[PDB]
Amino acid sequence: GAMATFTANFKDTDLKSFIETVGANLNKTIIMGPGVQGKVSIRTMTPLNERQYYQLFLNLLEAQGYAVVPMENDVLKVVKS
Amino acid sequence: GAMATFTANFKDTDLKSFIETVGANLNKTIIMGPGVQGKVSIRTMTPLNERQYYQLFLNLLEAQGYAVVPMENDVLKVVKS
């Protein structure tokens, strides 16, 4: 039932900037290790609700070789796996 | 990369006018119940995505005593809570 308003359409986008954008869109504080580097592409087929967008982000980062762990006070920390 | 593009800058405007303006920005037709009245000022601090913007709207209205009910054909209904 939740509103489906989240989309992604990135081609060869800087991965750090992508992570920052997603974090902002999810109202999370982002902590990134210095190993977080490179490019990512992702295009949603249809709009997502917030939880589905969060799930996509997790599944994508895992596939990219990045570990993503929640920390106190609304933090997501992303580091090399 | 361009979800977070909603903004608000309203000073001493009619609540009804504010509701209508949000509706237009969300491409939603507004249905208002009786006794929706007031004045509001509100300013976003950074640009918001649709979920964030809608939630800001809901939070503001709830503080005034109003609920929002999505309805069919891209309607938002605003009634006393």
UniProtKB/Swiss-Prot annotation, chains A, B:
Superkingdom, taxonomy of origin: Bacteria
Effect of deleting the gene: Severely disrupts assembly and function of T2SS-beta.
Subcellular location: Cell outer membrane
Coiled-coil intervals, chain numbering: none
Region N0, contacts GspC2: start-end pairs: 4-81
Other notes: Encoded in a type II secretion system (T2SS-beta); this strain encodes 2 T2SS but only this one (beta) is expressed under standard laboratory conditions.
Subunit text: Forms a cylindrical channel with 15 subunits, each of which interacts with the surrounding pilotin AspS2 proteins (also called GspS-beta). Interacts with inner cell membrane protein GspC2 in the periplasm. Forms multimers in the outer membrane. The isolated N0 domain forms dimers that self-assemble into rings.
Entry remark concerning the domains of this protein: The N0 region interacts in the periplasm with GspC. The S domain interacts with pilotin AspS2. The N0, N1, N2 and N3 domains are periplasmic, while the secretin and S domains form a channel that is partially inserted in the outer membrane. The cap gate extends out on the extracellular side of the channel partially closing the channel. The secretin domain forms a double beta-barrel structure; the outer barrel has an outer diameter of about 110 Angstroms while the inner barrel forms the central gate with a small pore in the closed state.
Biological function: Part of a type II secretion system (T2SS, formerly general secretion pathway, GSP) for the export of folded proteins across the outer membrane. This subunit forms the outer membrane channel.
Family: Belongs to the bacterial secretin family. GSP D subfamily.
Entry protein name: Secretin GspD 2
The organism's taxonomic lineage, starting at the top: Bacteria, Pseudomonadati, Pseudomonadota, Gammaproteobacteria, Enterobacterales
Gene for this chain: gspD2
Span within the parent record: 43 to 120 of 686
